[PDB]
Amino acid sequence: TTYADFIASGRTGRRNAIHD
Amino acid sequence: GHMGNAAAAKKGSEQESVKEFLAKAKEEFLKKWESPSQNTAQLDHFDRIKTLGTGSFGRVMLVKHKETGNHYAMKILDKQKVVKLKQIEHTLNEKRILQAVNFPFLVKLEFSFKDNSNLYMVMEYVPGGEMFSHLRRIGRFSEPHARFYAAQIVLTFEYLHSLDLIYRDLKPENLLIDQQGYIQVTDFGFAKRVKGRTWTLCGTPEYLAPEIILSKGYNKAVDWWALGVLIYEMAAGYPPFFADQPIQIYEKIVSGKVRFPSHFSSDLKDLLRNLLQVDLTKRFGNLKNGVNDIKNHKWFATTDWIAIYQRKVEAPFIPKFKGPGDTSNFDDYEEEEIRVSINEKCGKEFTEF
């Protein structure tokens, strides 16, 4: 499912800006 | 047509009144922009309580003003670290913007000052924490709940764009919830005052507009793209474009394809298809009708824009607040000392601060 794909992306936490 | 006489005249009058409001707001902003306030407090006016947030920028601490007892959020930047990270201009600009703007959903800079080692921005303390936490905890927001927040961002961007400010840093991590449940926008390091186009690759992968990814010159329409991302994530619980790695995210963003949860209303999908429009000639917020295409969209038909601006709408969610100084909506961080050297560091660089 899309939700499962989101969990699997590893990007569920706070996301940094590109410059970081 | 879609409106009879009464509704059409009411809408027209409302849209004219916005113009009048924004004209006055620009005059007020330009006065403060051109003569910024400086040096309105000092460090020993405050007791440092707890770190609320951290980053490469430095940290933000909850502080208490000794005389008044009022709590504030104090952003502390190490002048030498800012220089090393090539962030002098961004740091000066952030403070200059913050002391010049005035809007109910933009955090207020109550004091600022510097010492031999550090720069300090003392902002109002917004005790509800980041939208991000609430979103991840609750899972997703109902469409009315998402709309209440979205309406505040629409008005805030309407205000900022009228000042020729592009925001460029929209995401749930960067939106705080205040004690009445309303939004506060705090971070302005990536904001830029430009009338036309600009070219810097900056932002967060999931929220980047295609024209940024594609290394084009771009304009304030990237903020309306990012609003579409935010509304989608608030209502779905996950963003429209995600993947293991940013390069894969960018591929999806530029592809022109987006998919929606089955629980999204048709009105919401229509709005999002018009905000998440890769073709700049077709993106809402970038057309002849400007912000009106968004504000007059069916998904916002129940939104009383003036009532939102006046903060007379009952928020759908009030964060827990066990009294002033309460930090339960923030994370726990390791507490470092605040060292102030006997020797001024990077003086010339930060004259304007």
Ligand SMILES: C[C@H]1CNCCN1S(=O)(=O)c1cccc2cnccc12
């Ligand atoms: C991570 C940093 C910078 N990004 C926005 C959120 N924050 S912050 O939560 O510390 C944060 C930043 C600015 C003002 C604040 C006011 N009240 C509470 C917290 C505040």
